[PDB]
Amino acid sequence: HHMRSNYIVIEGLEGAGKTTARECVVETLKQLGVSDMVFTREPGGTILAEKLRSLVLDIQSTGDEVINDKAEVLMFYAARVQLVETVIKPALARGQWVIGDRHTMLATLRDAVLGDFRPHLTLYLDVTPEVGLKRARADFFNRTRARYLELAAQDPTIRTVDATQPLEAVERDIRAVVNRWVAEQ
Template identity: 70%
Template sequence: MRSKYIVIEGLEGAGKTTARDVVVQTLKELGIGDLLFTREPGGTVLAEKLRSLVLDIQSTGDEKINVKAEVLMFYAARVQLVETVIKPALAKGQWVIGDRHDLSTQAYQGGGRGVDRQMLATLRDAVLGDFRPDLTLYLDVTPEVGLKRARARGELDRIEQESLNFFNRTRARYQELAAQDKTIYTIDATQSLEKVMSDLRDVITAWVKELGA
């Protein structure tokens, strides 16, 4: 079976780390064990430095990051990760499990920030070409629930400190995009942990079995 790229998406506090663990366990039970994990922004030396610039509150001092500069830094980090880590891993036969990918930018910057959506789509196509995840698991959670969980983890980064309205817009864009793309599966992350884990296992199992059909 050809290697695949699976991405886990969602607002802060949606449970992406737990979801990754469930995905890994399920894949291993299905006989798929050669796995690589990535996160965005980040995953390479350069991309991690860009992550610090765009998310660390103290990294730029009093200078406010322009919205378009923010978008470009995300894409710079993304293309570096895709070209130097993800594509080579897939070519070697590894399955890649990603914590966020381009859907995050379309939702956070296109929805939350209100950046022109056509510009984002054009930039995505110019930078990534036709490279897309084979499967995206979108963990849908209300901002109220997600942010409460995120705060319980500790200090929030620059984007996590945005307003509730920002996250409502981001979630709405996530839901809109998920409804338009058959490779995106929505999981209700407000359910009990046991039900979320069960839903994830069911989706992964059915998807992998369909690939081998």
């Protein structure tokens, strides 16, 4: 039947094991008959974004100029738009699912450049402050964590998975969120 393509994002704070969670999302999608899909890295993910990264590093190494924060942001959204229009949207159009890692002024920019385009499911990997501290060895972070948790409550396309628990527990939960979500479609 070749189910409708969809766009699934994997968000989370450092040490959430996002790349390892991406694998679990893919395995579950395989079990559900999803066979054709694309893994994109949202930081990076296109040649354009890679060349912007090398440009910023080429400038910072020399010195004699400092990239203003706002300038970098617009370059970040330029990278995201390039990914949405040249990789993600076409991939969906061919029938390929797309699984991605790490997708007031920020909101205004999004509503302008991306318009209504949003991920179909966003999987937020929550990690507690203790967990973040273990990974750093190998807290402004509580405020960012809080924002993610507000968006998860307000947004029906955001599902949270407690990433602090053992691997097989996270796999159980990701597999459950995906099954429930797929069935609803």
